[PDB]
Structures are given as structure tokens and as C-alpha cells.
Amino acid sequence: ELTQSRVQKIWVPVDHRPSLPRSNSPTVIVMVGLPARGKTYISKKLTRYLNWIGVPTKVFNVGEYRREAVKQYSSYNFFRPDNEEAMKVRKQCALAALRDVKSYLAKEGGQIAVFDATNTTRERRHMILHFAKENDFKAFFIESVCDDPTVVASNIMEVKISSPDYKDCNSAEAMDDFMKRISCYEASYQPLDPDKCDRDLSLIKVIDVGRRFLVNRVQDHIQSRIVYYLMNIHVQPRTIYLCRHGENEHNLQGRIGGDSGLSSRGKKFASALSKFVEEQNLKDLRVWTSQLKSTIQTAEALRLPYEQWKALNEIDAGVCEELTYEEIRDTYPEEYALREQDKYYYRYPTGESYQDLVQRLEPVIMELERQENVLVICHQAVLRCLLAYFLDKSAEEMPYLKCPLHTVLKLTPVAYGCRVESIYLNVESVC
Amino acid sequence: ELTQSRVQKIWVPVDHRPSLPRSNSPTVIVMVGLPARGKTYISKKLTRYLNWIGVPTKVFNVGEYRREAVKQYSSYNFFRPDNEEAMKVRKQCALAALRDVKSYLAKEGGQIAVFDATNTTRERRHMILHFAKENDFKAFFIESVCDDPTVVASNIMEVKISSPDYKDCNSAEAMDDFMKRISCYEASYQPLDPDKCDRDLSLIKVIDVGRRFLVNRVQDHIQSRIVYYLMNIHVQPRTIYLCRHGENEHNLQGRIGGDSGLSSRGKKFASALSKFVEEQNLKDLRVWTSQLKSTIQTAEALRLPYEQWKALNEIDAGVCEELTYEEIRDTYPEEYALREQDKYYYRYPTGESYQDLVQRLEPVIMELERQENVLVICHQAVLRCLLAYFLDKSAEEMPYLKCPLHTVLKLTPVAYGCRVESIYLNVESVC
Numbered sequence A, B: 001e002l003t004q005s006r007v008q009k010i011w012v013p014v015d016h017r018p019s020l021p022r023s024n025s026p027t028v029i030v031m032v033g034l035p036a037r038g039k040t041y042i043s044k045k046l047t048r049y050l051n052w053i054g055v056p057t058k059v060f061n062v063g064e065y066r067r068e069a070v071k072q073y074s075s076y077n078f079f080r081p082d083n084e085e086a087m088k089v090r091k092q093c094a095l096a097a098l099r100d101v102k103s104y105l106a107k108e109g110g111q112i113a114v115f116d117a118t119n120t121t122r123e124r125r126h127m128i129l130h131f132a133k134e135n136d137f138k139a140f141f142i143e144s145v146c147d148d149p150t151v152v153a154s155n156i157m158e159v160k161i162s163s164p165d166y167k168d169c170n171s172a173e174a175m176d177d178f179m180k181r182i183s184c185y186e187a188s189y190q191p192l193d194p195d196k197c198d199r200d201l202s203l204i205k206v207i208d209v210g211r212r213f214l215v216n217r218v219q220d221h222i223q224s225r226i227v228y229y230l231m232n233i234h235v236q237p238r239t240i241y242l243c244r245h246g247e248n249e250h251n252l253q254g255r256i257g258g259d260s261g262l263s264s265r266g267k268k269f270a271s272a273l274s275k276f277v278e279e280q281n282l283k284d285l286r287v288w289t290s291q292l293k294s295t296i297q298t299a300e301a302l303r304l305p306y307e308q309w310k311a312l313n314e315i316d317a318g319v320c321e322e323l324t325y326e327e328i329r330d331t332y333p334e335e336y337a338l339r340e341q342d343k344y345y346y347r348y349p350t351g352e353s354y355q356d357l358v359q360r361l362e363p364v365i366m367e368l369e370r371q372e373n374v375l376v377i378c379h380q381a382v383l384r385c386l387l388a389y390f391l392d393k394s395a396e397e398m399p400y401l402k403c404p405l406h407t408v409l410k411l412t413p414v415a416y417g418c419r420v421e422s423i424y425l426n427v428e429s430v431c
């Protein structure tokens, strides 16, 4: 005796509860490396990734604990190794972060805590290891090694000088301060040593902006997924454009899904998309579509090579496919109402949830990380899922993100994330 | 104007051909390392993987060229570095393999050539690099480093002593010969050096049976996928059991697909499966199901924890879902006949192909590589796809593999692959 859950449609054993109804290991990811090595960029982008694929992850940025504890930054003097008081403030900030890590993992349902600090000494890492061990937490280390002066300078310009630590600073003096800050750490810096001392630690060393990796003792599937991700991201700037198919005939009829073709306005969008792309004047631009006709017709207007992904097809509405929202309310009032109250987890009978979409889209996201400029012509539910990943929107908000017809979303890197610009292509469509 | 292809259902631009109709880089993977380091095991298992996911791959095992050129092996004396004639035979075998690599990649449609030899000197690798460069082939190196005497001995016992090179040998003398063979290579062995000399090569060094990896300059998505795979396989023995759901009510009716429940014989299978598993007497056994009721009912009979994968659900027959094969022939004679002539690539309208299945199953296969003992309770088309991967069956044969109801397929490692044993659980079912 199994029953199907109403929202997610999962078969579960009938729990004929008795008259008194009665009701693995979390991981600490330890960032390691000199200042302006990408530790915070990695921490946030990895966390963005892990949350989107359904692993509860949170960043514990010790520098933010320090900013909050100390109130205003004046100089690199705070980071001198001979600075006894600042050392103990720094240490207290780390312990306060660790307190919060313990609470997040052991009491708030978190799976992955990203412990973002320098962690450049064996003694500090021994301290974190002791803490993970006493809490039954796994520990995975990510060290970023970058000795290239151009990359470090560029990192300082891009994220440091505009930091609230330097609000009372100009660029040249910000840069000069930050360079001296970095030199404070150099004498005591003990890089991870997997071939000797760190033999037994689970780690990845990311070398020269991802050109080279050293990987030791991956222990489980989450570490395995983390490593895979870290090995496929790159820092060089690029643009991602996302749009729906031009309006289609089912849009005109208010019928959901199917495989209908472009209306005459959908085809006007497709020509305008073509003019938009040409005006972007990109050296190389990849174009991706789903396998549904409306996206492929749209891409055909571009006269560029394109590639079809079945993983980009619109959410499968199962028994509701091809129905209007009025016929859904009437034939399946119960299904309509379940969906409205739990829109992310809700599965159409014999169809999909947004949650299912996320899993189908995982390889699309991994390949997008590998690409440079890309235009993705897709579908409402798909686009929302992709946008949530790029803009770090939660599961609960994902199915409501605003993704109208005939509008390009243009995503560009700024600092520790993505900026979105909307470009409406001035072609009417149903609402 | 787009038309949908008949077999694969792909939208393509109508090719209104004129009256005269007119009609990237391949990769050489270079194995590196001492004898009995797993080079051939890796070459074959990687190739098995790449072919199953649709990348045409072939192994060029230089040792097999040498076996064929020289006729009978007597001793390690053949591999002495002072052996002028054998050196030139070895070199000629390598060049003949390279000739075949060129032909496979440049003329036969191959994408990945796995060049399986020792390749232990910088001079030999320079030679292969020159060959890839002059052919416009990419080159990716995989070195296996293993200094553990227990692993090397175990490798010799498992694959070497039973080699046709040692047909006129007993174990002790086979082992002794092979150890001296290995020592021939040690003086001239130049390991890959990514931190200096090999700075510019695309490579992975696999260290101590996958405990540690060094990765340099992954150039593209195929190398990226290769690395991911190599990092998630392990050599320790284990068993995989595969079976269909116990017979279901749609089986009884000859209706395909749906989400029907177990018949009374399907439930007798489920109890017997339970007794079969208990008799296997495994320490730890993972159980995986799809999200369709019939597999989950089957797993419930086991009283073990199990995990549901949507990726394990039966092929989606789209418009043919829930129809009998007689109603399919009658309503869709054309679809019936397209399927019969091209069964792997054929997609049901609004449904799936075996090809689609393979893509959905990729993460199931990657996680299976990470596991130890696993029982997968699934569905006919799924099981066939999985079996093809484990038994290295081609795409064309995959949809015909024999996968009857109420029968466990038990897969165990032997040498460079998997052995299958069939265990019928003595419970009748429709045919």
C-alpha cells in the first residue's frame, strides 16, 4: 500500500500512524590563501551553485565579522603580525564565525558551511580541523594560489578599492595599502602540502586562475561535485543573453506547452532578435535552443549556427499539456490550487516540477560556465530556473521571476556576481 | 519553414535542395606509465564510457600490435633497453599504431583515439606530440603513478599471469618475469612534469589508485568530461544487481508505460527478490529505484532503505503511453515501422528515444562508479541502457538486450570489464 504525495507526486508507504504518532555529515569548506586570491569570489559562486542544485550552503566571511566588530578600517597596520590586539580581534572573529558555522550545520539544517578567511598557517587550520572533528563535521580545503602580479592587481581594482574598508580612499592609495596588507601574510604563509604534511586532508589547490589543480582525498559525492564545478569555471568576462522563443500560437490561445510554431508577432521578434544580436557586435557568439520548434524558428532568423538541447525544453505539464489555464481550473481545480500554494515543488501529474527542471538543467549550467558569449533561446519556466542560478534567487522565488515574451535578459559579471539588464525588443505579444 | 525528422523528431530547416544537391579537432589520449599501472584498464573503461555517451572512441594497444608482430613471448629479455632489435620492433609497433590512429580519426569518423603504451620517455612523447600537431589532433596525457608494491603485485596476478604472453608459464615464474620487465623501464622513466618541462601539456596524473590527482590545462569539454570520469572511478571489487520492477498490471494488459502497480505475481517476485538479497549476505547494500510505483513497491518488500531517481523512470512513450502494441500498430502504423528499423535513435512523438535515456542516465552511471554494492530496481529500456554501458554493447544492439521480468542481472568485475550472471527468481510473469 503506497499513496502518491499530492504536491510532488512521490509514491510513499501509507503511514497508518499508530494512535501516538512518533517523529549524512555536514561539511565545512575551509578557504585558504593570501588576500586577493579569489577566496570570497569562489565562496560565493560555489554557494550560489550548491544552493541552486538543492544543497543548503552558507558563506561565513570572517572579514565581514571583523568589519562589524571594528567599525572603520584605516590601514594595513591592522593586519601586521606584530599587532597583538588586532591578532586577538581577528582570532575572536574567526571563533565567532565558527560558532555560527556550528549553529548553521548542527541546528539550522545547513549542509555546507563555507569558512571564508585566509587560513594561511598550519596552526589556524589545525584549530579548524579540531573544531570540525569535535562536531563530527567533515572538512574540505580549497586553496587559491596565484603569484601572477597582473591578476592580483586586477583583483584589487575590481573588488578591493570599492570595498567599504576603503570608503575614505582613492584608488592609488587603496591599492598601495592592499599590497602592504598582502605582504603582512607572506612570512607565515604555509601553503597546503598534500605530498607531505597535508597528506591526509581532503583538498583542492586551484593554481593560476584554474590552469592547474592539485586534488587530494575526495571523500564523498558532494566534494566530488565541488571539485568538478571548481575545475570548470573561469574568470574571464563574457555575456549571457537569455530570452523566450518569439510568441507562439499556443501563447495566442492561452494553451500551455505543446510544440506550436511562431505566430506572426513571434516572427517579428525573431527578426528584431536578429537585429539586437548584430548591434551587440560580438566576436564570437554561441546560440543554444531547446528541441521545441518555437525556439528553433527563433534562432533560424539569426543566421548563426545553433545547437539544440533537449534539457532546455519547457517544463512538461503532463496531463495539463495543451490545456488553457481556464480548462485547468475547471478539470483539475485541486491540481490548480496545489500548484498555486507550492509552485516550486509542485509536479504536474505525469509531468514536471521546477525542481525537476533544475536537475535537467545542471549540465546546461556546467557547460555555460565553460563558454564565453552565449545566447540561450528557451522557455518561460526554463529561463526562470537559469535566471535564479545567475541571480542567486531562491527556490521559493524562482517560479515567479519576471520573464516576459520578446525581452532579452543580458547578464554581465560585476564584482562577485551577475548584473541583469532587460532589453525589450519592441514587438507586441499576448500577456 | 521547419519540418520534424521522422525517426528522431528533430525540427530542421526544410532543405528545398536546388536541382544539383550539394553535400571540432579529434583527440589523441596518450597513456603514460610503468607496466602494471592500470594503463590498459583505464584505456578500456574510459573508452567504454565515451562510446556509451556517444563519443566514438577506440583503444590502440601497442602491446597487442607487438603480440601480433612477434608471435610468441618468452621473456622480459625482449624489453631490455640494450635490446636493439626489440627496440626497433617496439618502435615500429608504435608507428603502426599511430598510422591506425591517423586513419581512425581522419578517415573513419573517430573522435578519440586512446594510444595505450608505456610512453615513459620525453622523446617518445615528443614524437607523439609531433604526430598530433602535424595531423591537427589534440593531445591529452593520462599518467598512472603507483609505487605501492601490493597494488603492482595484485595487478600482475589479476591481469598479467593469465595474459597470452605467459601461456607457457606458471604463476610464480610469470610474476618474476613481469617484475624484471618493469625494472627495464625504471632507469629511463621520465614522469610527466607539469610544474616545469610539461607546463604546456594537457594532462592528468592519477596517483596511488586515484587518491591524488594533478590536472594541467584542460582545453575543452571532452577533456573536462574525461577528467571528471577518471576522478570518480575506483578499483575495489563490488557487485551491481539490476532488475526490472516485479510484473505490473500494464504488463498483464500489454499496455506500455504508465505508472501501474504490481500484480500478484509482481509481488511474489518482490518477496523472492527479498530472499535473493538476503542470501547474497552483503555487508552494506544500496538500493535504488525509479519514481514509478512498481519499482518502489518492489523495493518496499526488501525492508532496506532505498532512494528514488527520476532519471531511472522508464522510457517515455509520449503519445503511445498506455497503449497496447496492437493499438500502436493500428493507430500509428508509420511510427511502429520507423521504430522497428531504427530502434535506438527513434523517438516516440512527444516522448523519448534510447538515446535520450543514455543522456538522462549519465549521472546514474557516474554515481554507480562511486558506489560499492548496489541493487538497481528499474525498467526494461533503462536496464538495457545500463547493461550496455556495463557490458560494452553498442547503440544498435542496446534496445534488443535480453532483460526479462523477474530476473536479476548480477555484474561483477573480472580483469578489464564486467561479467554478467543471470538469476531467475522462479516467479512467472507475462511474456
Ligand SMILES: Nc1ncnc2c1ncn2[C@@H]1O[C@H](COP(=O)(O)OP(=O)(O)O)[C@@H](O)[C@H]1O
Pocket (backbone or CB within 6 Å): A033, A034, A035, A036, A037, A038, A039, A040, A041, A042, A144, A145, A146, A151, A154, A155, A158, A159, A206, A208, A209, A210, A235, A415
Ligand atoms: N582562482 C583564482 N585566482 C585568482 N583570482 C581569482 C580566482 N578566482 C577568482 N579570482 C578573482 O578574485 C577577485 C576577487 O577577490 P576576492 O574573492 O575578494 O579575494 P580574497 O577573498 O582572496 O581576498 C575577482 O576579481 C576574481 O576575478
Ligand SMILES: Nc1ncnc2c1ncn2[C@@H]1O[C@H](COP(=O)(O)OP(=O)(O)O)[C@@H](O)[C@H]1O
Pocket (backbone or CB within 6 Å): B033, B034, B035, B036, B037, B038, B039, B040, B041, B042, B144, B145, B146, B151, B154, B155, B158, B159, B206, B208, B209, B210, B235, B415
Ligand atoms: N590508477 C591505477 N593505479 C594502479 N593500478 C590500477 C589503476 N587503475 C586500475 N588499476 C589496476 O590495473 C590492473 C590492470 O593493469 P593494466 O591495465 O594491464 O596495466 P598496464 O597497461 O599499465 O600494464 C587492474 O587490476 C586494475 O585493478
Ligand code: ALF
Pocket (backbone or CB within 6 Å): A244, A245, A248, A251, A257, A314, A378, A379, A380, A381
Ligand atoms: F511556451 Al513559452 F516561454 F511561452 F515556452
Ligand code: ALF
Pocket (backbone or CB within 6 Å): B244, B245, B248, B251, B257, B314, B378, B379, B380, B381
Ligand atoms: F513496465 Al517495465 F520493465 F515492464 F518498466
Ligand SMILES: [Cl-]
Pocket (backbone or CB within 6 Å): A079, A080, A081, A184, A185
Ligand atoms: Cl598577518
Ligand SMILES: [Cl-]
Pocket (backbone or CB within 6 Å): B079, B080, B081, B184, B185
Ligand atoms: Cl625498456
